[PDB]
Design a protein around this ligand. Structure first.
Ligand SMILES: CC(=O)N[C@@H]1[C@@H](O)[C@H](O)[C@@H](CO)O[C@H]1O
Ligand SMILES: *[C@@H]1O[C@H](CO)[C@@H](O)[C@H](O)[C@H]1NC(C)=O
Ligand SMILES: *[C@@H]1O[C@H](CO)[C@@H](O)[C@H](O)[C@H]1NC(C)=O
Ligand SMILES: *[C@@H]1O[C@H](CO)[C@@H](O)[C@H](O)[C@H]1NC(C)=O
Ligand SMILES: *[C@@H]1O[C@H](CO)[C@@H](O)[C@H](O)[C@H]1NC(C)=O
Lengths: 598, 196, 598, 194
């Protein structure tokens, strides 16, 4: 007498013991491609991925026999739901064929694009190697403007039709997935509907995020109002005193990150800045030392040290020319105990923080590996990189560095140093939140059909003017495609991970720090040598996605919701100082300032 | 004084998969137990029976050696009263166990790049194994109401599954080799001796 | 009484008086960019051209209503044949966009291509300034080989995918015009449908050209045997007497022209090689004098002198710093009586010759203006440059220079000087004929489907070994695309023009000299001061493409076929001397010798 | 009568009419010496079909007609008796028997501008050739074929008048030339224009 439940558990047992290794082979082939790029290795990696893909779909069709309602409780229930939603078999074969060509076409278009000087057609620049350096570093108004307009124009115009086709096909694909609109599909990841009637709904995500933006808008408004006064000195006649900033001047190609505006807007220039790169180099520190110190930090709280498999197996340094590699840092959860970190590490402060951050990814993977195979993907899209940013935050503090030996004890930490530090932090952390929110809301809305094709650009900039306070230097009609210009947009990637990515680090830091009985300001928090924080954190990590993410969050912070209170508390000192400096200057945007309309 | 031939059991270059575990009977030797512990290369060498130092003097009726290969995580199942997929369905020691269990990491020779799928285990069974029972049945298992048509299909699963062993795997998923000694005394006079 | 012929005459009447001006606006706008390069002027050129293209398509589509079959006498049905053929109704829009993107991509890759020294990665050379200089002037085997292989490897490998797709699409595009293959479309220029039975066919051109190659092979084989003997001295251990020459050693990037090997192979390295540049400078000759004397020569034969518009509007001198321009010489027929020459003239001998050559283009240009607009293209692919080079031949002779005053009259013209002259000319003129023929043979075969893609390279070099006697220095597998390495191939240009141009060049030269009653060797003929020769030339020149090219040819040279008899007769003195010099050395080649095969 | 003839107002006229609408400026008792016009000798073309200008010393006539228009340089040959082309057939036709002078000079400097001066017009199609001194300003759309023209340009309905394209860079032939045509008429009525 086997209840349909009881059978389903047997099926999943079979799935776990068969699929674990097969997934392993796909992970290993992909890893081999990244660490030894060659066309043969590409073909092998794709072939293994094809084996895993076909197997997964066969398991989906077998999985459909056990129906969720008859299933009782509770991760096994959840496991089946992941299994049933195959993934791609919904779009007509012909439409699938058009879609893949469209997707790869846009990906290549973005990667292949290059821009020439107007009077110098022979001189050409690429964004990823060359324009990034121009956009971050330049002080010249006109050069920055030409690069921005050229990139958005030359690449964009080619993409403005393909995105239109991509929207329709993706919308049909989602409507076939019983996920209306497709923007709706992306927000699927958060919602935990099976919470006994109290489940998160995917439509609710928009409501929560909007509330977040209004809650965050005061800090963003003051930060911007301060920045525009600082920028005005550098470009005297090109920024309007009451108007929104032009898009190009924000410190990178689209304005996502304002960290490159830190030198322009530094509050206290003479006070000494914090870089331990030279101290790192002068001390004979190698990449192995960087990661060993990292592992030691995780050891202090009570989390396990790296596996033997981790050390011998990861690519932490660029090989040189044993091979060519992708230089981007990536954290791997390959499978059965192969946990690897891949980085082209350099002995710099940036790579030290990034290494500490990546090891957090590994620690998450390692902790929740015990849970069943399908429930090993963090807790929501935003949990993972969030955890990493928490570990980077605790380590970056000066107090930790003095104990490390990278900073002389005789660094005076006064009013000025910390406020300045928080400003750089605000440009990266707070600056991107309205950009990310606005970009997404645009994608979600377009998928909804709330925006007609012929108003895309118009509406895009309206939102950017109203929500982000960034303005176009030159009018853009309805043949250019600016939203696609961002990498995450051009290659179908959900961008809301970054907005919530923040709402997490702090809500979590605040707690962990409170648990460690840290007596002091929030931003100076260091949780090192506090096992108790390690255990609370360990309890969250081990669960993974077994539980609904609401409950997992509640165990750490005694709450089931995204709260930006901690973020604002992190930035409150900078917040007050900002109010003091902005008394004599205008705060807020007027929605319609344009440089061209004189 | 026929020095026991344990070396052939422990130093053997081929070990059988866990479900088809080999019993290598050892009779009429003098057996030195000191050498096993003083070799001291083993990851796991606990006698639950009596202390190995203390059993050198004791003389046994018959001594059987059980050898097989399993995952690292599964090593903890090779103990009395422990339960799991290995102990329930492959090799189950008795609750009243009085012997040594030895295990070591096999990664060097038992795992090859691309996978050594030659090791097998029993995933499904109608009833849990009795102590020291070996089941090599290849009969298809019917999870659900529908019967085995004698053929693999929906809700008819093949009982045996291949261990996937690879060099890069984690210490837990690394293949380990196991050797179990079992000790028995009977009314007939005991002859499997040690240094009494 | 409204017959379809009459209606058609009205339609073309309207078209002529309408289209003449618009073509003018496109031509003048085009002139502005070439004389004042800037982005703004480029955009003006593209816009004006866009109006011309749209208008042209409307008039052609409209032209289809009047059908050729009902049309009677006689240029009007040729005019209609040109017009009804419209360029673009013929390929799918997606394929049009993809194809044009491919075509532009190849041009950029070729023009932008650069190759690095293996010692220093950042030091790189481009073909146009530097690689041409190395291949043209260098003597070092390995340096020359490095440039050749690097360019064929770095540029070629990138071009191969583009060429495969390019071939497939170009054949499909060609079939839409109801032409069997792309080669067939290129052939179509020669086609003569105005003869009732004696028409020239698209298949026949190949047979004529092939027969010509067989006729030319004795002189070429002897020239080759002589050249390789001279080369062996310069390069001691890399040239085999029974083997073919290596590709790099011919004096340019692909071996098209042997003119730069004259210092290596001069017959009498003691007799002076006539250059009048110094003498021209000493007499105070300005660029204006070069063009005035050229006009005088054409006036002498009986052709009209230049228009006032030519003098005032043309660019005969390098503009200087006021404008910026590409210096390549061009003869412009803007239309509406406006004929210009664009040249950056220098006081040199070559520019004197080039001035006569370009001015011949103009003399034809003025001559065919009288006939209707569509019949002003010229009579054949090769007729134009044939006329120009023919004019250059008469002038280059020492007698003409002696009359000029550039040479002292008693400067000696002995056998040796003449042999030197014929050798230098033979390297340029005869050397290129099999390179060109073999090249177009390869492309035509590929378009036909006669060459499989997988065997592209292997067949190509076989032909090079068999037909041209050039051998690859390094084995090239099928990823390389060496034919594309030549500019003409990469930018989709018919290459057979030069081959037919040489045959019509000496054909015309012989006829005109015969009319000038010049008795002597053919190369000493100067047609100067001969009204009769001018008048026969005028009768042909005025016709343009109104008549089928065969008939116009028959009026000039009393024959309707491509004849190399005149070409071979011109080089007969050098041919005989070549036989005398060759017979102590091997003449011919064994195809399977390669430098890599030791 | 010592009164001199307004030739100056005609020849020096800043604005000239298009060929199809040739202005006839009637000569009314406008006694002028014809010697000075040839004596000016600035003209590109001055052929009198009839009698010599020199021989015009003591001849006075009932009426003298001066026709002024602008045409292409190539078309000047058409402005002669018995010549045929688009101009002579469809715009302005001299009589077979001509007893008058025809005057033309190059007009490029004032009649052509950069970017194109399209103001001068000619009649391209017409049902029948013009009689001497016949002027047609019809704007009626031309019926090439049997099908009827609704007054809208289309297939076999082409507009008869088309715009001249004059530009500074054009060739001598396509350069605009200005034309002045004189006619002399003697009648039984009293002769008055000396
Ligand atoms: C190129 C050539 O020889 N032209 C001739 C010229 O030398 C000669 O003075 C003239 C006399 O009629 O003729
Ligand atoms: C990299 O790929 C090549 C492709 O043949 C292979 O031979 C080589 O072993 C690979 N390198 C490593 C470290 O696996
Ligand atoms: C690393 O973890 C292992 C767990 O087996 C432990 O034995 C060891 O002491 C740890 N190392 C450090 C430095 O804490
Ligand atoms: C296995 O070989 C080693 C190597 O000498 C030996 O010391 C050991 O005693 C052998 N094992 C047994 C059980 O005898
Ligand atoms: C050359 O180009 C510039 C671009 O602004 C233009 O202003 C100038 O008039 C051009 N020169 C001529 C002679 O047209």
């Amino acid at each position: 007498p086997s209840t349909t439940e009881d059978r389903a558990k047997i099926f999943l047992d079979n799935f776990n013991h068969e699929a674990e290794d097969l997934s392993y082979q796909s992970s290993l082939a992909s890893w081999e491609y990244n660490t030894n790029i060659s066309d043969e290795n590409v073909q092998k990696m794709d072939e293994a991925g094809a084996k895993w893909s076909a197997f997964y779909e066969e398991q989906s069709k077998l999985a459909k026999n056990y129906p969720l309602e008859e299933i009782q409780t509770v991760p096994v229930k959840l496991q089946l739901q992941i299994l049933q939603q195959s993934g791609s078999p919904v779009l007509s074969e012909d439409k699938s064929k058009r879609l893949n060509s469209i997707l790869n076409a846009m990906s290549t278009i973005y990667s292949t694009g290059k821009v020439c000087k107007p009077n110098n057609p022979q001189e050409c620049f690429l964004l990823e190697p060359g324009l990034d350096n121009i956009m971050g570093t330049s002080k010249d108004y006109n050069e920055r403007l030409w690069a921005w307009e050229g990139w958005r124009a030359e690449v964009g115009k080619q993409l403005r039709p393909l995105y239109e086709e991509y929207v329709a096909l993706k919308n049909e694909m989602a409507r076939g997935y019983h996920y209306e609109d497709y923007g709706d599909y992306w927000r699927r990841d958060y919602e935990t509907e099976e919470s006994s009637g109290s489940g998160y709904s995917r439509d609710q995500l928009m409501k929560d995020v909007d509330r977040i933006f209004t809650e965050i808008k005061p800090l963003y408004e003051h930060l911007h109002a301060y920045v525009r006064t600082k920028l005005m000195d550098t470009y005297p006649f090109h920024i309007s005193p009451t108007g929104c900033l032009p898009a190009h001047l924000l410190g990178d190609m689209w304005g996502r990150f304002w960290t490159n505006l830190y030198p322009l807007t530094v509050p206290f220039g003479q006070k000494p800045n914090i870089d331990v790169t030279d101290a790192m180099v002068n001390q004979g520190w190698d990449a192995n030392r960087i990661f060993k110190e990292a592992e030691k930090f995780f050891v202090s709280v009570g989390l396990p040290n790296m596996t033997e498999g981790f050390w011998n197996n990861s690519m932490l340094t660029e090989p040189g020319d044993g091979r060519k590699v992708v230089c981007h840092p990536t954290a791997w959860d390959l499978g059965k105990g192969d946990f690897r970190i891949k980085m082209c590490t350099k002995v710099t402060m940036e790579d030290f923080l990034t290494a500490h951050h990546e090891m957090g990814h590994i620690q998450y993977d390692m902790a929740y590996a015990t849970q069943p195979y399908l429930l090993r993907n963090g807790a929501n899209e935003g949990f993972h990189e969030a955890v990493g940013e928490v570990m980077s935050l605790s380590v970056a503090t000066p107090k930790h560095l003095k104990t490390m030996g990278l900073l002389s004890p005789d660094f005076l930490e006064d009013n000025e140093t910390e406020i300045n530090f928080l400003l750089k932090q605000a440009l990266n952390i707070v600056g991107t939140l309205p950009f990310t929110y606005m970009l997404e809301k645009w994608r979600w809305m377009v998928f909804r059909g709330e925006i007609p094709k012929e108003e895309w650009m118009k509406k895009w900039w309206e939102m950017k003017r109203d929500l982000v306070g960034v303005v176009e230097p030159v009018p853009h009609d309805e043949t250019y495609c600016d939203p696609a210009s961002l990498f995450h947009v051009a290659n179908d990637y959900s961008f809301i991970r970054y907005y919530t990515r923040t709402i997490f680090e702090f809500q979590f830091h605040e707690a962990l720090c409170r648990i460690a009985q840290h007596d002091g300001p929030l931003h100076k928090c260091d949780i090192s040598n506090s096992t108790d924080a390690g255990k609370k954190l360990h309890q969250m990590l081990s669960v993974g996605k077994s539980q609904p993410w609401t409950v997992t969050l509640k165990d750490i912070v005694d709450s089931r919701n995204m709260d930006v209170g901690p973020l604002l508390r992190y930035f409150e000192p900078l917040y007050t100082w900002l109010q003091e400096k902005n008394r004599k200057s205008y705060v807020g945007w007027n929605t319609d300032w344009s440089p061209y309309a004189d | 004084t026929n020095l026991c031939p344990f070396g052939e059991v422990f130093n053997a270059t081929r070990f059988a998969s866990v479900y088809a575990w080999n019993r290598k009977r050892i009779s009429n030797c003098v057996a030195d137990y000191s050498v096993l512990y003083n070799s001291a290369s083993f990851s796991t060498f606990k006698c639950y029976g009596v202390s190995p130092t203390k059993l050198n003097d004791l003389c046994f009726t018959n001594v059987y050696a059980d050898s097989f290969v399993i995952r690292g995580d599964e090593v903890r199942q090779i103990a009395p009263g422990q339960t799991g997929k290995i102990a329930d369905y492959n090799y189950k020691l008795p609750d009243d166990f009085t012997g040594c269990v030895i295990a070591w990491n096999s990664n060097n020779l038992d795992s090859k790049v691309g996978g050594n799928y030659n090791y097998l285990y029993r995933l499904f069974r109608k009833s849990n194994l009795k102590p020291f029972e070996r089941d090599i049945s290849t009969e298809i298992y019917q999870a659900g109401s529908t019967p085995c048509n004698g053929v693999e299909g929906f809700n008819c699963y093949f009982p045996l599954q291949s261990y996937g062993f690879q060099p890069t795997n984690g210490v837990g998923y690394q293949p380990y080799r196991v050797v179990v000694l079992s000790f028995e005394l009977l009314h007939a006079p005991a002859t499997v001796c040690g240094p009494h």
